[PDB]
Amino acid sequence: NVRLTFADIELDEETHEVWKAGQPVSLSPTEFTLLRYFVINAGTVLSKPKILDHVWVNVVESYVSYLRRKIDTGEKRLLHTLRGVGYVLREP
Amino acid sequence: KEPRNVRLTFADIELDEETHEVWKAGQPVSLSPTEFTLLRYFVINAGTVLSKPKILDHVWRYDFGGDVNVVESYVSYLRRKIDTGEKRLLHTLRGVGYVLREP
Amino acid sequence: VRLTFADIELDEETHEVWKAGQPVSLSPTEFTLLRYFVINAGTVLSKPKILDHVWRYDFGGDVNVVESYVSYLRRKIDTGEKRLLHTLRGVGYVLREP
Amino acid sequence: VRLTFADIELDEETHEVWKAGQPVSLSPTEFTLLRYFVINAGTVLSKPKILDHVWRYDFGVNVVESYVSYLRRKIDTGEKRLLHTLRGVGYVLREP
Amino acid sequence: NVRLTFADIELDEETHEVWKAGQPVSLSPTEFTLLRYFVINAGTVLSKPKILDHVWDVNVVESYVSYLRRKIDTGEKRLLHTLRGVGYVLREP
Amino acid sequence: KEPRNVRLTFADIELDEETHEVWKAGQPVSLSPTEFTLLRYFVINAGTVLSKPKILDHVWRYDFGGDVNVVESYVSYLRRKIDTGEKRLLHTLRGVGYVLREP
Ligand SMILES: [Cl-]
Ligand SMILES: [Cl-]
Ligand SMILES: [Cl-]
Ligand SMILES: [Cl-]
Ligand SMILES: [K+]
Ligand SMILES: [K+]
Ligand SMILES: [K+]
Structure with a gap:
């Protein structure tokens, strides 16, 4: 997947470039x-x-x-913890 | 091998399809x-x-998040990045959508 | 490859530009x-x-x-005490030394 | 090309190094x-x-x-140190 | 002269790099x-x-x-001098 | 094409003859x-x-300014650039010259 995306997170597998809300990370x-x-x-x-x-x-x-710290510190959080099961990337 | 033009323009916005560079009013974006x-x-x-x-x-892609x-x-x-100046080019048509045009 | 006028310098190969010795x-x-x-x-x-x-001639608008x-x-290039890019009302523009 | 220990990452090709996700x-x-x-x-x-x-042995x-x-000073800046001195014995890279 | 120098001025004709007193210019x-x-x-x-x-002109x-x-000659010892009516000269004091 | 070592070392000074990079105590100079x-x-x-x-x-070169x-x-x-640490490596021997050595 050349560009890979979820919500406003963007990854470029060839350059290993990443953006969150349009800003480079x-x-x-x-x-x-x-x-x-x-x-x-x-x-x-x-x-x-x-x-x-x-x-x-x-x-x-x-x-x-x-x-x-690098990708999820905005108002709406996309990376969540649910104890004893693990982690999940999802919109609130 | 290089006789090429891959730029698009609207008004004072310039895009390069190869590099993904963009300029607005001469300034890089x-x-x-x-x-x-x-x-x-x-x-x-x-x-x-x-x-x-x-x-x-x-x-x-259709297989993205469809919201x-x-x-x-x-x-x-x-x-915020491209349409900051006095004459806005990117407008909202409430209940219909958006349009790029001169005002 | 080098094109100059007064203290404006262009590199026709790299598209680098200088004014008064400074990159622009x-x-x-x-x-x-x-x-x-x-x-x-x-x-x-x-x-x-x-x-x-x-x-092109039909690149119109408002x-x-x-x-x-x-x-x-x-604003980028014509910042010297002596301006080089002049307006000639009803006629156009000219690059020249004052 | 990728060599990692804990949160130290080395690229054997480019010689790029990261610690705790940050370039060093x-x-x-x-x-x-x-x-x-x-x-x-x-x-x-x-x-x-x-x-x-x-x-080499004769650096002196x-x-x-x-x-x-x-x-x-560059790499072992985390709350948990990874590069340890063992007096009279040497050094070891390990997680505390 | 791939490397060219006078006093503490250095030029690299291939890269067009220049140094004055060891500092890039x-x-x-x-x-x-x-x-x-x-x-x-x-x-x-x-x-x-x-x-x-x-x-x-x-x-x-x-x-x-x-x-x-302004870029290469503002230190204590000036190397680029004016001789009014004759021209300019690069030399040590 | 590149089975090569073009580095010189003295103490904690490292030089690369190809790139002219230098490091002192691990830091670039x-x-x-x-x-x-x-x-x-x-x-x-x-x-x-x-x-x-x-x-x-x-x-x-001999044809330089010979002063x-x-x-x-x-x-x-x-x-000023390479020898600012507490332990100086570049020393002056008044009336004889300079030497690079541990003190
Ligand atoms: Cl997509
Ligand atoms: Cl050695
Ligand atoms: Cl080797
Ligand atoms: Cl020389
Ligand atoms: K045309
Ligand atoms: K060895
Ligand atoms: K060596």
Whole structure:
């Protein structure tokens, strides 16, 4: 998917460029892989071991946190936690 | 191999389809791919009033998130970047849609 | 590849531009307009002539694109104590030294 | 091309480095030293070993101590430190 | 002379890079050509018509000598000098 | 095409002969070509005391400006950029010259 998108998040797999609300965002390779995994699986609740398996437990929490800081600090939050099940990318 | 023109223009907006560079009134504007696609769609269709349904259909793949609320958001982002000056080019036709035209 | 008039410098290859020794960023249309003035330095160029050269004769609308782009270009490039880009009312514009 | 340990990421092709998702600029020697640690994560590496790996045995191990310091100041800035000194033994890259 | 120098002025004819006292200096193509002309002719007094001939209005020479001075010659020891009625010269005090 | 090492090292100074990049204690340093040539000359000759005459002869072409005062200037410019740490590597031997060495 040349351009890949969900809501107002945009990724370019060839350049590894990312935008949120039209503004560029600099991600490390792991952060990009992680965001891509959420976006391709938008709306699906993803456990930590599942994320760990596909992107590579505490490292998952760390990188979800890093990613949230770069891409999810606006009024409407797209990356959500639901305890004991995992994380989900979805509109409120 | 390079005898080429890949620029589009409307009024004082200039776009390069290859680089996705954009200029407004001679000044560079940084657009995301979605903002670029949206601007291109307005430019190619300048003077036409475009409902939120058509834009959605054209600016993203059908398999995207199909909500006229995303369109509204992106039109907002685009306007902030490209349509800041005294004469606005990007107008809202309440209950009908948006149009790129001279006022 | 080097085109100059007074202290305006254009690189015809890279489309780099300098004024008074300092780099100036121009859009593609601004560069084309400036080049047209420079290769015609001292020659008066009417608005219809510039319009049909840089754009085309039917590139119409409400406000005139030639006037607009001359303004933009002057704000970028014609900042010296001595102006080089002059308006000749009813006739056009000319690039020349005062 | 991609080498990672915890939240340190190296691109073996471009020599780009990230820590906690943020780019970090390293000198060629700092990059070699960091790569050596990452490919040997969890393995204790003595100063003479690092010296002869990154430089050579007859450099003449203060340079190892210096470059570990430089690298820690660039890369080992998280709340949890990853680059650990083992007195009389060497250094190890590991999660606390 | 891929690398060209006088005193603490340095020019790189391939990259058109310039340094003064070890610090980079950005010059336009005309400024570079003009500085190069002074450097190759270090110590020689150069009239305005001579400079005009080789680098390209008499006022354009004055203008560019001024621009060049501002970028490369504002330290304690000045290297680019005016000899009124004769021209300009690159030399140490 | 690129099985290559073009780097020189002394202590915590690193130079790349191709790109003319330099690092001191891991941090980049920008040198002019003359400063680079001078550093290279000290590095290749580390521990040797070098008079102003030798440096002049080696760091510029003979057909340059042959003044030991230029050497002094450039050694000053180089020290300011590469040798500002607590532990100085570039030393002056009054009446004899300069040397790159640990103190
Ligand atoms: Cl899409
Ligand atoms: Cl070595
Ligand atoms: Cl090697
Ligand atoms: Cl030389
Ligand atoms: K035309
Ligand atoms: K070795
Ligand atoms: K080497």
